[PDB]
């Protein structure tokens, strides 16, 4: 063991020096240096499988060290899977070691996240999907580790792999944003994940929130690397509605997913156009001609007499609709987010009216000052 | 029966998990607290001992009390993981001694440092000059690991006890394993 | 305006949009308790329990706030 | 071994606190 670390363990440049330092930590009993510095050398991927094979020998050293499992065991397992390569039964062994030795219950939930990922690789939407449900129970309500919630997101993203349910993907990606420590995530790797998020991830019908996720800053900046026109087309479906020029562009932006759901997405933009008139314009411009709705639903004006009824049928938002000109002037609507900087919320609509009221309130006081007494 | 109340600051950290001192550094730290509480009890029964972790969270683990039973229970299940935050803890300990209604009891602080502290040396020196105005003796026993030579703490102790001051002894961790009795002798020999 | 007490409860959760940590106090509805013979010390000096001032000054207060 | 003896000593300290808790329980019961 001491001899093994001194010469055989060394592989990459600087490994003999770091392993000699590791021996000093082993004698000094400084678990923290072993927990962070030794695992940091393990974190480097240049060694790949070779560090992982050494890691099994180091795991025996780690058992003597008795470093905290939530930090030490998870890092060891992260490179243990690299050593495992294809783990037909290797996965059972690593899970067995994690189950047998648990510093804390939180480490046990971390073990579950690994079990689900390994099961996902070998099997789809079976025990692994149920294990993803089990991990939700194991996580409970504790987000203090935060990285553990990211591991929980990883199985949630794995659930998106198991069933297309792009809505589940939309929820997990949002969960990842909350449980990620910050932009400390590798920017290029996240930009590459955002390239997929920009492509299939947002092309999936699961996310279309008028910028609730699309206009969120971290992902959109990473999605700038992904084709800008496709990213614009995603905003265009939600707020640009029909966006017929963008409709030609969306086929260019991503042929996969868009072509499969083009009819369904066309229906979704038609529904989006109906929601758009009421929330964006309150009264006045909210009322609009049938031909504008025909352009909004990208359908013929004669067809829109039939089409407006179908869009009205979805009834996502309760309202009042008049078919004299197909004008909206409807009641309740839910905007995913307000446009621009909420200019309507400023003196354009609100606040300015409130200023007018207090002057009239003063008129009531002037009308009857003696009565106020 | 000299009247004194000591707001000791314990440390709970991944560094404290290391067991180079005794079987465990935390157990050795608990033993060091046990002897000081016994020494205070021998000096006076009314003497009050209170302790809190100076790592991550620096509140009050136990309010200062003449009985040592609360002190022992707080040492039990201390749970170590938080990164050391000595500056916040030292400020809390000094004011907490003022907080006690019985200010007549002499005010002293004993602290344990398990990890290097990432603080500007000037900032701790400024606290140390304020501590000198407060005139409350502070002696720190570094445990297991410390900033090399505890240079910032050595300057902090000098600022705390300058101009022929108490010069309360600062114990840098003895390199490698250290006996608890070896650690206890230096404070018993002199503050 | 409103009432003197402000109610806040602090909870830890993951924001759906993705705000980091997402731990903050959350406002909750607050009300005034019921007691007997309590305003004999205070309200006895003044008080205005009648429909006489309804629509005479009550409308003014709402417009005022 | 020695660690087990140390754990027993910590439990004995808890038992001393428990004797005080028993007196407190008796005092509340006595009232």
UniProtKB/Swiss-Prot annotation, chain A:
Matches recorded under Pfam families: PCI, PSD13_N
Tree of life domain: Eukaryota
An MF annotation (GO) of this entry: structural molecule activity
Modification N6-acetyllysine, positions: 295
Domain PCI intervals: 168-335
A GO cellular-component term linked to this record: secretory granule lumen
Keywords associated with the record: Acetylation, Proteasome
Species: Homo sapiens (Human)
Role description: Component of the 26S proteasome, a multiprotein complex involved in the ATP-dependent degradation of ubiquitinated proteins. This complex plays a key role in the maintenance of protein homeostasis by removing misfolded or damaged proteins, which could impair cellular functions, and by removing proteins whose functions are no longer required. Therefore, the proteasome participates in numerous cellular processes, including cell cycle progression, apoptosis, or DNA damage repair.
Family statement: Belongs to the proteasome subunit S11 family.
InterPro entries: PCI_dom, PSD13_N, PSMD13, WH_DNA-bd_sf
Name of the protein this chain belongs to: 26S proteasome non-ATPase regulatory subunit 13
PANTHER family in the cross-refs: 26S PROTEASOME NON-ATPASE REGULATORY SUBUNIT 13 (PTHR10539:SF0)
Family annotation (SUPFAM superfamilies): Winged helix' DNA-binding domain (SSF46785)
Gene Ontology annotations of biological process type: meiosis I; proteasome-mediated ubiquitin-dependent protein catabolic process; ubiquitin-dependent protein catabolic process
Curated annotation (Swiss-Prot), chain B:
Molecular function terms, GO-annotated: identical protein binding; molecular adaptor activity; polyubiquitin modification-dependent protein binding; RNA binding
Gene Ontology BP terms: proteasome-mediated ubiquitin-dependent protein catabolic process
GO cellular component terms listed in the entry, alphabetical order: cytosol; nucleoplasm; nucleus; proteasome accessory complex; proteasome complex; proteasome regulatory particle, base subcomplex
Crosslink site: Glycyl lysine isopeptide (Lys-Gly) (interchain with G-Cter in SUMO2): 122
Location of the VWFA domain: 5-188
Keyword annotations of the record: Isopeptide bond, Phosphoprotein, Proteasome, Repeat, Ubl conjugation
Task performed by this protein: Component of the 26S proteasome, a multiprotein complex involved in the ATP-dependent degradation of ubiquitinated proteins. This complex plays a key role in the maintenance of protein homeostasis by removing misfolded or damaged proteins, which could impair cellular functions, and by removing proteins whose functions are no longer required. Therefore, the proteasome participates in numerous cellular processes, including cell cycle progression, apoptosis, or DNA damage repair.
Domains: entry comment: The 2 UIM motifs are involved in the binding to a multi-ubiquitin chain in a cooperative way.
Family: Belongs to the proteasome subunit S5A family.
Name of this chain's protein: 26S proteasome non-ATPase regulatory subunit 4
Taxon lineage: Eukaryota, Metazoa, Chordata, Craniata, Vertebrata
Residues of the full protein shown: 1 to 191 of 377
Curated annotation (Swiss-Prot), chain C:
Gene coding for it: PSMD7
Function of the molecule: Component of the 26S proteasome, a multiprotein complex involved in the ATP-dependent degradation of ubiquitinated proteins. This complex plays a key role in the maintenance of protein homeostasis by removing misfolded or damaged proteins, which could impair cellular functions, and by removing proteins whose functions are no longer required. Therefore, the proteasome participates in numerous cellular processes, including cell cycle progression, apoptosis, or DNA damage repair.
GO cellular component terms attached to this protein's record: cytosol; extracellular exosome; extracellular region; ficolin-1-rich granule lumen; membrane; nucleoplasm; nucleus; proteasome complex
Keyword check for Acetylation: yes
Full-length numbering of the shown residues: 131 to 195 of 324
Domain of life: Eukaryota
Cross-link Glycyl lysine isopeptide (Lys-Gly) (interchain with G-Cter in ubiquitin) mapped to chain: 50
Additional free-text comment from the UniProt record: Does not bind a metal ion.
Name of the protein: 26S proteasome non-ATPase regulatory subunit 7
From Swiss-Prot, chain D:
Source superkingdom: Eukaryota
Localization, UniProt: Cytoplasm; Nucleus
Posttranslational mods: Sumoylated by UBE2I in response to MEKK1-mediated stimuli.
Protein task: Component of the 26S proteasome, a multiprotein complex involved in the ATP-dependent degradation of ubiquitinated proteins. This complex plays a key role in the maintenance of protein homeostasis by removing misfolded or damaged proteins, which could impair cellular functions, and by removing proteins whose functions are no longer required. Therefore, the proteasome participates in numerous cellular processes, including cell cycle progression, apoptosis, or DNA damage repair.
Clinical disorder: Deafness, cataract, impaired intellectual development, and polyneuropathy: An autosomal recessive disease characterized by early onset of deafness, cataract, severe developmental delay, and severely impaired intellectual development. Patients later develop polyneuropathy of the lower extremities, associated with depigmentation of the hair in that area.
Subunit structure: Component of the 19S proteasome regulatory particle complex. The 26S proteasome consists of a 20S core particle (CP) and two 19S regulatory subunits (RP). The regulatory particle is made of a lid composed of 9 subunits, a base containing 6 ATPases including PSMC3 and few additional components. Interacts with PAAF1.
Organism from which the protein derives: Homo sapiens
């Amino acid at each position: 063991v001491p001899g093994f670390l001194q010469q055989s363990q060394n592989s990459g440049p600087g490994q003999p020096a770091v392993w000699h330092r590791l021996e000093e930590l082993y004698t000094k009993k400084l678990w923290h240096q072993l927990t962070l510095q030794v695992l940091d050398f393990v974190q480097d991927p240049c060694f790949a499988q070779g560090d992982g094979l050494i890691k099994l020998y180091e795991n025996f050293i780690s058992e003597f060290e008795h470093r905290v499992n939530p930090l030490s065991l998870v890092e060891i397992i992260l490179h243990v899977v690299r050593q495992m390569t294809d783990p037909n039964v290797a996965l059972t062994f690593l899970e067995k070691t994690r189950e047998k030795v648990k510093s804390s219950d939180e480490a046990v939930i971390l073990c579950k996240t690994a079990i689900g990922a390994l099961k996902l690789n070998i099997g789809d939407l079976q025990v692994t999907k149920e294990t993803i449900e089990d991990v939700e129970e194991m996580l409970n309500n504790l987000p203090g580790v935060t990285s553990v919630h990211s591991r929980f997101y990883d199985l949630s993203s794995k659930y998106y792999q198991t069933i297309g349910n792009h809505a589940s993907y939309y929820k997990d990606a949002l969960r990842f944003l909350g449980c990620v420590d910050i932009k400390d995530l590798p920017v290029s790797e996240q930009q590459e994940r955002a390239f997929t998020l920009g492509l299939a991830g947002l092309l999936g019908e699961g996310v279309f929130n008028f910028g609730e996720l699309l206009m969120h800053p971290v992902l959109e900046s990473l999605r700038n690397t992904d084709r800008q026109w496709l990213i614009d087309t995603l905003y265009a479906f939600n707020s640009g509605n029909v966006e017929r020029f963008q409709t030609l562009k969306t086929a260019w932006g991503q042929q996969p997913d868009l072509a499969a759901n083009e009819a369904q997405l066309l229906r979704k933009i038609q529904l989006l156009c109906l929601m758009e008139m009421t929330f964006t314009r309150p009264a006045n411009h909210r009322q609009l001609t049938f031909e504008e709705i025909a352009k909004s639903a990208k359908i013929t004006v004669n067809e829109v007499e039939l089409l407006v009824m179908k869009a009205l049928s979805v009834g996502l938002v309760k309202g009042s609709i008049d078919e004299v000109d197909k004008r909206v002037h409807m009641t309740w609507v839910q905007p995913r987010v307000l446009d621009l900087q909420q200019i309507k919320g400023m003196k354009d609509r609100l606040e300015f009216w409130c200023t007018d009221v207090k002057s009239m309130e003063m008129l009531v006081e002037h009308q009857a000052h003696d009565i106020l007494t | 029966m000299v009247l004194e109340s000591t707001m000791v600051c314990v440390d709970n950290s991944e560094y404290m998990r290391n067991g180079d001192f005794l079987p465990t550094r935390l157990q050795a730290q608990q033993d060091a607290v046990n002897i000081v509480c016994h020494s205070k009890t021998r000096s006076n029964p009314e003497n009050n001992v209170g302790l809190i972790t100076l790592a991550n969270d620096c509140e009050v683990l136990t309010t200062l009390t003449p009985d040592t039973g609360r002190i022992l229970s707080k040492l039990h299940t201390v749970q170590p993981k938080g990164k050391i935050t000595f500056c916040t803890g030292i400020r809390v300990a000094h004011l907490a001694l003022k907080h006690r209604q019985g200010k007549n009891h002499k005010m002293r602080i004993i602290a344990f440092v398990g990890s290097p502290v990432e603080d500007n040396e000037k900032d701790l020196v400024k606290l140390a000059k304020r501590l000198k105005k407060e005139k409350v003796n502070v002696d720190i026993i570094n445990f297991g690991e410390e900033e090399v030579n505890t240079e910032k703490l050595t300057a902090f102790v000098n600022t705390l006890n300058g101009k022929d001051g108490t010069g309360s002894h600062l114990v840098t961790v003895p390199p490698g394993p250290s006996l608890a009795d070896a650690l206890i002798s230096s404070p018993i020999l002199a503050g | 305006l409103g009432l003197p007490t402000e109610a806040y409860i602090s909870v830890e959760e993951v924001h759906d949009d993705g705000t980091p940590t997402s731990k903050t106090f959350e406002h909750v509805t607050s009300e005034i308790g019921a007691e007997e013979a309590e305003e004999v010390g205070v309200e006895h000096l003044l008080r205005d329990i009648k429909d006489t001032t309804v629509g005479t000054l009550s409308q003014r207060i709402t417009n005022q706030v | 071994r020695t660690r087990l003896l140390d754990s027993e000593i910590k439990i004995m300290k808890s038992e001393v606190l428990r004797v005080t808790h028993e007196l407190q329980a008796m005092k509340d019961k006595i009232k």
